[PDB]
Amino acid sequence: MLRWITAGESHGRALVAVVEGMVAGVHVTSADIADQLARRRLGYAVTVLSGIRHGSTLGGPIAIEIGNTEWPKWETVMAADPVDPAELADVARNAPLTRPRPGHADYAGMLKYGFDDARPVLERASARETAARVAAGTVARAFLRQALGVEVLSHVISIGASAPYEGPPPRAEDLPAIDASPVRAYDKAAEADMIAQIEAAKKDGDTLGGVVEAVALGLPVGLGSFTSGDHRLDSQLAAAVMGIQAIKGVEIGDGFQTARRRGSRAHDEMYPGPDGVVRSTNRAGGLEGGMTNGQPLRVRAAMKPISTVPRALATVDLATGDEAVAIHQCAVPAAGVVVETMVALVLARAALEKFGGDSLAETQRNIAAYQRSVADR
Amino acid sequence: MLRWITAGESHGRALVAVVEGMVAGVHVTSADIADQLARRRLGYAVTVLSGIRHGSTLGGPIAIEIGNTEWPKWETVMAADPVDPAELADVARNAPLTRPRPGHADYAGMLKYGFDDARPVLERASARETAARVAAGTVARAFLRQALGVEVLSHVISIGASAPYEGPPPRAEDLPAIDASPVRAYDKAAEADMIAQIEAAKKDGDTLGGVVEAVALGLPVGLGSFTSGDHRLDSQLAAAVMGIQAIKGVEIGDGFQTARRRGSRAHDEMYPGPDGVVRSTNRAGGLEGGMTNGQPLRVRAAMKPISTVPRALATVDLATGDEAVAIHQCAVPAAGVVVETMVALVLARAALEKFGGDSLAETQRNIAAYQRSVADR
Amino acid sequence: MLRWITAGESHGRALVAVVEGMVAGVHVTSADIADQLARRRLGYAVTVLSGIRHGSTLGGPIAIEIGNTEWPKWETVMAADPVDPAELADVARNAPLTRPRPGHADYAGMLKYGFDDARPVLERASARETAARVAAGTVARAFLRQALGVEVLSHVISIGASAPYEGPPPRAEDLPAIDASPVRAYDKAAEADMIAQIEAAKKDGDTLGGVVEAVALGLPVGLGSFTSGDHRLDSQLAAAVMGIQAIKGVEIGDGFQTARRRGSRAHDEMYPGPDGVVRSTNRAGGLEGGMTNGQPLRVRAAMKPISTVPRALATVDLATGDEAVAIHQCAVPAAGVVVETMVALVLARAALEKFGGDSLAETQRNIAAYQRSVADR
Amino acid sequence: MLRWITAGESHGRALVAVVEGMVAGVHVTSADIADQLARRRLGYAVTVLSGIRHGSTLGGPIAIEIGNTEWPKWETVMAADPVDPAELADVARNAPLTRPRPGHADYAGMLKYGFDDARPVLERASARETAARVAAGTVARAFLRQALGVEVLSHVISIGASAPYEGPPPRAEDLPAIDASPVRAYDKAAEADMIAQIEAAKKDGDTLGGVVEAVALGLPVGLGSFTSGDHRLDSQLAAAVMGIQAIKGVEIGDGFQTARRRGSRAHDEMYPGPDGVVRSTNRAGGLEGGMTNGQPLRVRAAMKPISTVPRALATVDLATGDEAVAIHQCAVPAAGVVVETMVALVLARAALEKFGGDSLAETQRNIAAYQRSVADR
């Protein structure tokens, strides 16, 4: 049973991702992880410490370290061990952060943990942590591809007030074009609209959020279950995606728009096919009653504008109780990449749950046999 | 650490809800549970078996049984023990269900579990299970009220193509009026619009979904955490709400609309107040960076139309591979009630996580002290 | 992933066992459960509410209710709902329990939960709860037999000061003789010694504990893992067995005696065989480095004397702070039966972890294929 | 809710310990961790990557890296990324390991994971992993001391055939003398006996196991619970201790010897005292009915001889199916140190479970208040 953990402060020495429960024999390398970390940097130092040998998973815990290049600047302010308080009071960088940014973990985090300073909160809350997620996600990704022939990608639906691209989702062969787009858009018209919204926001010195859609292709029928709320795959995906920094909404398939349609036009009808049932629409986004139906999985995430707009947001100085202005510390296309990663981690877990196995070869045997059994129906 | 489990088939003898980890000394009765089960039946036999003594929780597992009144009709078809297969083949009610309904667990469930018959799938997948959830939810509810003075309610935002009510959410004092509404609407104009959509759908012999909003009031700052994706309260709520039958989307606060706003207008600014920070908007829906900020928690759920529209939905007969039509087996206002329940279960768990305690009095002491500590800031 | 929960107070209306995550298609009936509950009653009303249809598991949560026959006597004192406090003060049975028994949950439970009365503590702490465990255990048992040809049994090693039977463990064919023994002894000489110890203790009006050994036969190699402490099968078994009421020690195989042997004589040497490796000793008790090695699994549990000895044990009246004497509310052979049950639950979970599957047939395919793969080595 | 994870192969680049859920404000440093790692090396390079700032925990995940000094020798054989298979076949160090050692994870691990080589199994299974545990344990240790004034230590009861020290356990002030002993013995006579057994085994070229006892002092009443098997503190401790490499048995207090006593002499009687109940014996080892009773917690672990005895143990070459002899790759006093660590991790988790809190100060308030409440009884 797959588990993943991230660790690290934004300005700490390094980030760590640990993945536990991954079967032995999955091919994945430092380079794969770096490639995926590079994809996270798209939009307008990796060390594998354990669990992988000669590019193949060992079956034990996989620990992946991501170095922080800025560490020399932070090694006193973010030092693990005590530092002379007199030497530290002379360090401008160590100044108190007492003006919580609206929209961020600052205020609630300070109160919750009894902090006088927001620094310990933002260091961990920061979306720099998503880099560790992506390191972990790459392992799930390699597993999904090699065990199931499953591919995970994403594309941006809207940024700011752009008109949502509601056409067909991309396939895996479209990923280079998507990744090459400044807004990771699949649709050229939608692309132009989004770039325009960004240009105008940039000019106004403002910030934007957006909507992104992860797509997983090639899934077998029956991952997740209808047996309880927690086992529904959409429940698990929603947790994994909503828990991403700045995400305020999650949809499966046509999501909130489904809730505005009539039953006669809301669902995906089934028809006879050569190698099983075929559907002509995918309004469900590949999930029905908590399980994969074989159609492309579509998961959409709504990201709020996350970058603090300079001198726009009133706040309070918790030190004084006086009015203040939040001092700043779009990322929509990268959010799409992070969503891919969380979707992959969840899918990989659900796959190991149904197909079991301790090595890829074993898991592959069980998959094959389940597929043969379904075909023989 | 609070856990909840539901058990039961729709036409089985009874449903069971088990709640584990609830502190001793919470006042809750059979009548409370029945009251909340009654609320679930709003819209256009309870036996407490364990864990409660004289209307006060014991600290052990709380098992709540909900009887099925139709059991005599089903006691052979849904018999636990073997039944002579010749006697059963003469029972019309035991006929094979081999035409999976689009939008339901039928097809994927049959394939996943190797079933030839959809009966075992729909029996457990059916939203009749939400009654067991609500039994469990009532315990969390009583805890939230008595430990924290927290109230949970809901109201319907839209049904079918109605214009979404986007005005202010209701307070606890508005619940009778909401519950008295045929569509559990808070807004009279929105109400009329929704009733109209329903009337027209009824006439067309069609079905509707909708959007509902659970509201939790009185929450302390700091439930949930920013420390990882799984600990974010919005992550937990999303899992609990998305896992409800027929839910296709979840939002916190202004959700997907936040993703279409500029940073300067997207967030909730903070200002000085007498007894702490005050905000003038609640676009975040009471959650920031994974934690409660003290504002009303707003959680919205998108429900797809769930009732099968007679002779509209093409499907396949899995027995033959031939075309077929799905045979049928809005519920928006009741969905709102179920969402309340899932929100309450999650909030109660997060509260016990931060405030600990083995009895209500102990948990109340820790709450009080945390609140004093925050006030003294 | 198998989970089990028990609920119920000793004098409550009923006990409930819930088992979640069990694959569909396992044959098990009310009668099987009753048979195993009967075995628990060896030594000197079952209702299946959910998850089983026509004697075959459905794949959903399995809820099993066990009625309390004494309920009419307790329905006011252990009433779930409030009862007039004046009517209750006239009930002798509802008298305060304020003299905690040494060796029991009484004192620590009262302090922990802020109880003035030990009643809520002993009602849940009581070993009557093991009946619910055994109901749950029967499902795991049926699964182990049908999926893996695995059998679980037990026998008593010692009671009181008897000389421990250290000969060979029994096989499944020996269970009737063991069950027919007044002390569930496998060895006739050991039996006579144990009966003598009991006779002498009975005469002295005293109580005894003992040591029991669960044996699981037919296990495949490789359940559990060496990958971390929590995944070691011996870790899981130890948790499941030590958590049984009155158990103070757990051993795998030769346990504490292994720690007194030299490395040259402590382990089980391997030799070539026709259908795989064979060992001539089983000092390890079928577990090495956290995993099953194919040898009989042997798990031993040390039970303390649990029955309070009348007027022997000094205690304190918490109401007054005055000296008092504990007022009483062997069971070694039944402990053996309970240990069987906990071993079976853990083994079944570990099996589903490695072999996966959502139905027995699927799990059986994966098992077969893993076994073929091992044979082809 | 405290969680701990270890990662690393014995000859990999480094070990990683991650601790999640630890409250903010606990004072612990690199030096503390190194000190405790040094204690693990008693008997006949630490880098804190995250979660700690200026010697005080941040509340987020704490990642601790322990470097392997031998890494340059292993950086090709245990390289994470692929290495030219022709270059690797010339490396003597990379030779196949196909003769599983009796008593080790080798055989079952190879079969389970489909390995042809035991290397991936022993790399992770090796007790070198306990160093990562101890890094994690140090955090729990600091928490226990600062939140609860709790101290954890250990001493060796027996090694090989020595006569078990059954006198009183040590207190915290005795730790230097214990740590200074070659066998970490508390008792001088027992010490001499153990050294003799070792001398004789060394001379015979053989290996020994032993029994160790962890002692935790200063615990509040009521950690753990009687509410179910999994919540019993003895259940949790047993899992944590049995899961240590080479441990074959666990006891609480007088353990297996309790099972040989009569009820009248088996338990710890309670008597009136100035500041609460007092006991004159501690046969229970500080745990009753699943919870701490305030007495010293005593947990004993039986370690099998772990070092392979050269040319004594027959095995099979899995490559050929031919007879072979196991080639080798006491540690009792260090086992005691590891047991301390696992006990501390479990106690710290149980403490956070009851007392909650997100910072030490908050947890301390809740502790104080629970203690006052108990005193006022």
Count the residues in chain C. 377
Which residue of B113, B208, B291 is in closest CB contact with A108? B291
With CB atoms and an 8 Å threshold, state whether D227 touches B1: no
* Residue closest to C215 by CA, chosen among C297, C156, C148, C303: C297
| Category of B284 on φ-ψ map: left (φ > 0), alpha (ψ -120 to 50) or beta | alpha
Annotated binding residues of B for FMN? 124-126, 245-246, 289, 304-308
Q: A306, A209 in Cβ contact below 8 A?
A: yes
Backbone angles phi, psi at C5, to 5 degrees: -135, 140
* Residue closest to B3 by CA, chosen among B67, B51, B68, B56: B51
Distance CA(D111)–CA(A362), nearest Å, equals 11
With CB atoms and an 8 Å threshold, state whether B227 touches D355: no
Q: Give residue A97's Cα distance to chain centre.
A: 28
Instruction: Identify the burial level of C41 via C-beta atoms within 10 angstroms of its C-beta, where 0-12 means exposed, 13-18 middle and 19 or more buried.
Output: exposed
Backbone angles phi, psi at C116, to 5 degrees: -90, -10
Q: Which two tokens stand for residue A271?
A: 């028809």
Can you list the alpha helix ranges (DSSP code H) found in chain A? Answer: 30-40, 71-74, 85-88, 106-113, 119-125, 130-148, 175-180, 188-203, 233-242, 255-258, 263-266, 332-355, 360-376
With CB atoms and an 8 Å threshold, state whether C277 touches D107: yes
* Residue closest to A131 by CA, chosen among B263, D48, D19, D50: D50
Nearest C-alpha of chain C: how many angstroms from B303? 24
Q: First and final CA of chain D: distance in angstroms?
A: 29
- β-pair partners for B210: B159, B303
For chain D, give percent helix, strand, coil, nearest 5: 40, 20, 40
With CB atoms and an 8 Å threshold, state whether D268 touches C102: yes
Q: Give residue C180's Cα distance to chain centre.
A: 19
Would you give the DSSP letter of residue B178?
Answer: H
Nearest C-alpha of chain B: how many angstroms from A54? 31
* Residue closest to D354 by CA, chosen among D187, D173, D227: D227
Nearest C-alpha of chain D: how many angstroms from B276? 20
Enumerate the residues of chain B whose CB falls inside 8 A of the CB of residue C46: none
Instruction: Give, in order, the Cα–Cα distances in Å from B105 to each of A292, B115, B246.
Output: 10, 12, 10
* Residue closest to B327 by CA, chosen among B78, B91, B97: B97
At residue D20, the 3 state secondary structure works out as strand
By what technique were these coordinates determined? X-ray
* Residue closest to C216 by CA, chosen among C233, C235, C202, C195: C233
Backbone angles phi, psi at D117, to 5 degrees: -130, 135
Distance CA(D304)–CA(D249), nearest Å, equals 9
The amino acid occupying position B337 is V
| Category of C205 on φ-ψ map: left (φ > 0), alpha (ψ -120 to 50) or beta | left
Instruction: Give, in order, the Cα–Cα distances in Å from A322 to each of A110, A308, A325, C282, C328.
Output: 17, 20, 10, 74, 66
Buried-state track C203-221, b at ≥16 Cβ within 10 A, e below 16: eeebbbbbbbbbbbbebbb
- C168: Cβ contacts below 8 Å, ≥ 6 apart: none
With CB atoms and an 8 Å threshold, state whether B58 touches C30: no
Which residue of A222, A243, A268 is in closest CB contact with B229? A243
Q: D67, D76 in Cβ contact below 8 A?
A: no
- B95: Cβ contacts below 8 Å, ≥ 6 apart: none
Annotated binding residues of A for FMN? 124-126, 245-246, 289, 304-308
Backbone angles phi, psi at C55, to 5 degrees: 75, 15
Q: C352, C236 in Cβ contact below 8 A?
A: no
Distance CA(A344)–CA(A338), nearest Å, equals 10
Distance CA(B254)–CA(B274), nearest Å, equals 27
With CB atoms and an 8 Å threshold, state whether D226 touches C105: yes
Residue C350, number of CB atoms within 10 A of its CB: 22
Q: A298, A215 in Cβ contact below 8 A?
A: yes
With CB atoms and an 8 Å threshold, state whether A18 touches D5: yes
- β-pair partners for A262: B208
Q: Which two tokens stand for residue D118?
A: 């035991």
* Residue closest to A187 by CA, chosen among A174, A200, A201, A173: A174
At residue A253, the 3 state secondary structure works out as coil
- D2: Cβ contacts below 8 Å, ≥ 6 apart: D19, D20, D21, D22, D140, D345, D348, D349, D352
Which residue of D16, D20, D58 is in closest CB contact with A49? D16
Nearest C-alpha of chain B: how many angstroms from C58? 6
Backbone angles phi, psi at D211, to 5 degrees: -125, 135
| Beta-strand relationship, D270-271 and D278-279 | antiparallel
Enumerate the residues of chain D whose CB falls inside 8 A of the CB of residue A80: 29-30, 48-49, 52-55
Q: Tell me the count of B-D CB pairs closer than 8 A.
A: 66
Distance CA(B266)–CA(A305), nearest Å, equals 7
Q: B97, B118 in Cβ contact below 8 A?
A: yes
- β-pair partners for A67: A14
Query: Mutual orientation of helices B360-376 and B130-148 as an angle, nearest 10°?
Result: 50
Enumerate the residues of chain A whose CB falls inside 8 A of the CB of residue B313: 264, 267, 269
Q: Which residue of B has its CA nearest to D358?
A: B354
Query: Which homologous superfamily does the CATH classification assign to the domain defined by B2-377?
Result: Chorismate synthase AroC (3.60.150.10)
Q: Which two tokens stand for residue C70?
A: 């004494």
Q: Which residue of D has its CA nearest to C229?
A: D243
Nearest C-alpha of chain B: how many angstroms from C190? 40
* Residue closest to D116 by CA, chosen among A218, C341, C374: C374
Q: D16, A18 in Cβ contact below 8 A?
A: yes
At residue D236, the 3 state secondary structure works out as helix
Q: C360, C147 in Cβ contact below 8 A?
A: yes
With CB atoms and an 8 Å threshold, state whether D79 touches A54: yes
With CB atoms and an 8 Å threshold, state whether A238 touches B242: yes
Helix (H) or strand (E) holding C233: helix C233-242
- B153: Cβ contacts below 8 Å, ≥ 6 apart: B170, B172, B174, B175, B178, B214, B215, B217, B340
Query: Mutual orientation of helices C130-148 and C360-376 as an angle, nearest 10°?
Result: 50
Q: Which residue of D has its CA nearest to C331?
A: D259
Q: D57, D82 in Cβ contact below 8 A?
A: no
The amino acid occupying position A16 is V
With CB atoms and an 8 Å threshold, state whether D160 touches C201: no
The experimental resolution of this structure, in angstroms, equals 2.3
Helix (H) or strand (E) holding B213: strand B210-217
Enumerate the residues of chain A whose CB falls inside 8 A of the CB of residue B314: 269-271
- In chain D, where are the structural domains located? 2-377
Backbone angles phi, psi at A55, to 5 degrees: 75, 15
Q: A40, A131 in Cβ contact below 8 A?
A: yes
Distance CA(D62)–CA(D56), nearest Å, equals 11
Residue A282, number of CB atoms within 10 A of its CB: 17
Nearest C-alpha of chain D: how many angstroms from A248? 22
- C219: Cβ contacts below 8 Å, ≥ 6 apart: C148, C150, C286, C292, C294, C297, C347
The amino acid occupying position B70 is E
